[PDB]
Amino acid sequence: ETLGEKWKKKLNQLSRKEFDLYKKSGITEVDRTEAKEGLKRGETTHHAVSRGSAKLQWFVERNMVIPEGRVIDLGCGRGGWSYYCAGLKKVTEVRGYTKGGPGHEEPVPMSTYGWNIVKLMSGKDVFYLPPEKCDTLLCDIGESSPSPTVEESRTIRVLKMVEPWLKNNQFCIKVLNPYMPTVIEHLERLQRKHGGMLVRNPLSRNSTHEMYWISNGTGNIVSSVNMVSRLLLNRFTMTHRRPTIEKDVDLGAGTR
Amino acid sequence: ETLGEKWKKKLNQLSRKEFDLYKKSGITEVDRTEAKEGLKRGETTHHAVSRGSAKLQWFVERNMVIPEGRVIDLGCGRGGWSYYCAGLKKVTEVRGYTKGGPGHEEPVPMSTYGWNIVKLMSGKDVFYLPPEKCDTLLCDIGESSPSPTVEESRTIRVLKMVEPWLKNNQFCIKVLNPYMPTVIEHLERLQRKHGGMLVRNPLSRNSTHEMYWISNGTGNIVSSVNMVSRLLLNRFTMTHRRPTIEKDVDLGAGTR
Ligand SMILES: Nc1ncnc2c1ncn2[C@@H]1O[C@H](CSCC[C@H](N)C(=O)O)[C@@H](O)[C@H]1O
Ligand SMILES: Nc1ncnc2c1ncn2[C@@H]1O[C@H](CSCC[C@H](N)C(=O)O)[C@@H](O)[C@H]1O
Ligand SMILES: O=C(/C=C/c1ccc(O)c(O)c1)OCCc1ccccc1
Ligand SMILES: O=C(/C=C\c1ccc(O)c(O)c1)OCCc1ccccc1
Numbered sequence: 001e002t003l004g005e006k007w008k009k010k011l012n013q014l015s016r017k018e019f020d021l022y023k024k025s026g027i028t029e030v031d032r033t034e035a036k037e038g039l040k041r042g043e044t045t046h047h048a049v050s051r052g053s054a055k056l057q058w059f060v061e062r063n064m065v066i067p068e069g070r071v072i073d074l075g076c077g078r079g080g081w082s083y084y085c086a087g088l089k090k091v092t093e094v095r096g097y098t099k100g101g102p103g104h105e106e107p108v109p110m111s112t113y114g115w116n117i118v119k120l121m122s123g124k125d126v127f128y129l130p131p132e133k134c135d136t137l138l139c140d141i142g143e144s145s146p147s148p149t150v151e152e153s154r155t156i157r158v159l160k161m162v163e164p165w166l167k168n169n170q171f172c173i174k175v176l177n178p179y180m181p182t183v184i185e186h187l188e189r190l191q192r193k194h195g196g197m198l199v200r201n202p203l204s205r206n207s208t209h210e211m212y213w214i215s216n217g218t219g220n221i222v223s224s225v226n227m228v229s230r231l232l233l234n235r236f237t238m239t240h241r242r243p244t245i246e247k248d249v250d251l252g253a254g255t256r
Numbered sequence: 257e258t259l260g261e262k263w264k265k266k267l268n269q270l271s272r273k274e275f276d277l278y279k280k281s282g283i284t285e286v287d288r289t290e291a292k293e294g295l296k297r298g299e300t301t302h303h304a305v306s307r308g309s310a311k312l313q314w315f316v317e318r319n320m321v322i323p324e325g326r327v328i329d330l331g332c333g334r335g336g337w338s339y340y341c342a343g344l345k346k347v348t349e350v351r352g353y354t355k356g357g358p359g360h361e362e363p364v365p366m367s368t369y370g371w372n373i374v375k376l377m378s379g380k381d382v383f384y385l386p387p388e389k390c391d392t393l394l395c396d397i398g399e400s401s402p403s404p405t406v407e408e409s410r411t412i413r414v415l416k417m418v419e420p421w422l423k424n425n426q427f428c429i430k431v432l433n434p435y436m437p438t439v440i441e442h443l444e445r446l447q448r449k450h451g452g453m454l455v456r457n458p459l460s461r462n463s464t465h466e467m468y469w470i471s472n473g474t475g476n477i478v479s480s481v482n483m484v485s486r487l488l489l490n491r492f493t494m495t496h497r498r499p500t501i502e503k504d505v506d507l508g509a510g511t512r
Contacts (some may be wrong), residue, residue, distance in 0.1 A: 038440065098361065127473070127474045127475075128319065128472050128473055128474070129472070130425075130426065130451055130452065130471040130472055131424065131450065132424050133424055155472070157475075160474060160475070160476065161474040163448050164447065164448055164450060164451035165451075188391040
């Protein structure tokens with residue numbers, strides 16, 4: 001049994017009270033207050049549509065993924081990754097795809113900097129999308145479940161889906177459950193073929209074991225995974241530590 | 257040894273009487289009577305030239321392949337796939353290629369809806385046809401044999417041939433024998449490069465293990481192939497169910 005599996009079982013036994021305290025203990029998070037109010041008033045400039053803009057930025061600012069050229073954003077939801085990439089120098093085009101409808105976030109239209117190179121398309125199930133040519137492949141799909149075996153299956157499905165989109169391009173792909181042995185096996189194969197590394201984003205909540213397979217890095221997958229498991233297990237054992245609050249992204253205005 | 261190989265052996269040892277029962281047990285089939293008679297009288301409107309029009313329809317109405325723009329139809333034979341696509345809104349041109357001559361079906365001239373955008377060309381061996389730039393690649397080639405090794409080699413040949421035609425386009429390609437290990441290996445490589453999924457058409461007879469590699473899907477090829485093998489093996493025992501008969505396609509009349 002994996003360290004991650006022990007973590008999951010412990011997480012599943014928490015009360016909703018214990019869970020709510022745990023989920024943000026010692027994490028980093030952006031202050032969304034300003035953005036949430038502006039969006040409520042239908043402002044279309046400056047604000048990130050979600051916590052996702054800031055999350056992707058953390059990777060980009062550390063050169064783990066360097067968005068360039070034609071960017072595909074699989075599971076774009078409201079569009080946080082898409083809008084953020086649209087303001088980056090090397091990026092020429094952003095195409096976002098998301099399922100929408102009951103239970104799923106719909107793309108939010110914005111006029112943040114570089115909006116004119118973005119197209120977000122709802123009603124698109126990525127498992128039925130043919131792969132297109134692109135220079136950056138982003139994917140943020142993976143729905144949490146109390147069952148790790150369910151999560152294991154969802155994770156493998158994503159990994160099998162993304163592979164045809166990968167051809168010596170930049171990438172950043174969510175791995176919802178990286179600790180189950182079968183996933184590890186797949187990731188090892190994928191790293192051998194396409195390189196990259198798994199990385200834990202500090203803006204991730206303790207309530208999820210998600211890690212991101214980014215293109216620009218090397219290292220041991222198993223080691224990285226166990227380190228996160230250790231971290232998350234330890235964060236059970238301490239009274240809540242309030243999250244480190246950071247300024248949310250300003251995504252600006254106007255065409256490029 | 258694969259589940260498919262076991263099915264083949266069981267199939268080869270059936271009597272012609274047992275075969276004739278088995279081949280249609282529980283399948284779906286269109287009623288070709290009306291169409292067969294009209295075509296005998298030389299009528300050129302409404303009728304599909306083969307069972308193929310209905311067969312392709314099944315995929316298209318489920319978004320598995322979305323014919324659009326320039327459509328190439330490799331192994332068009334009488335022209336069932338070509339004439340069907342010719343009436344679809346997004347399709348602009350249909351070019352069908354088939355071998356013809358002794359033993360092989362010749363294109364049948366028709367005036368079904370959109371006939372004027374179809375060009376069906378006999379005396380064309382697809383294996384010597386330079387790859388052309390198309391938006392939809394269809395291919396329905398693959399001759400049965402009692403020997404799965406023979407079928408294996410025929411299948412690989414087709415898969416090698418189709419590959420250079422595929423470039424982020426829509427496609428639907430027959431895989432005559434998808435259960436032999438070497439074919440599975442090739443399909444796995446192709447799916448990694450080009451994506452798509454293998455699918456079983458219910459209008460297929462139990463007498464063939466053919467599956468179609470369609471562009472708009474993802475998933476595990478081995479798993480899907482074994483599911484068909486299981487379905488076909490079970491249909492040996494489960495006592496005969498007469499085929500579910502449906503109405504054949506009405507392909508209309510006139511230019512577009
Ligand atoms: N099969 C599928 N195809 C397409 N989108 C899917 C999907 N399954 C889940 N999704 C979507 O994937 C999204 C992941 S959350 C999106 C966060 C985004 N990066 C941002 O910046 O805001 C959800 O909106 C969910 O609806
Ligand atoms: N190497 C080859 N080059 C061209 N056509 C070929 C071929 N091998 C087989 N064929 C043709 O492919 C056809 C397969 S039948 C599939 C045709 C489908 N029912 C339709 O109507 O569109 C046969 O008629 C056969 O003559
Ligand atoms: O069971 C689930 C799973 C869905 C899920 C989770 C995390 C994700 O990143 C994601 O893409 C999908 O729902 C989350 C539970 C929930 C819902 C509303 C309010 C509070 C809590
Ligand atoms: O709420 C969740 C947890 C995951 C998650 C992922 C990403 C997020 O950004 C987030 O806020 C949450 O998903 C539901 C699964 C679950 C619930 C309770 C216990 C165990 C498993």
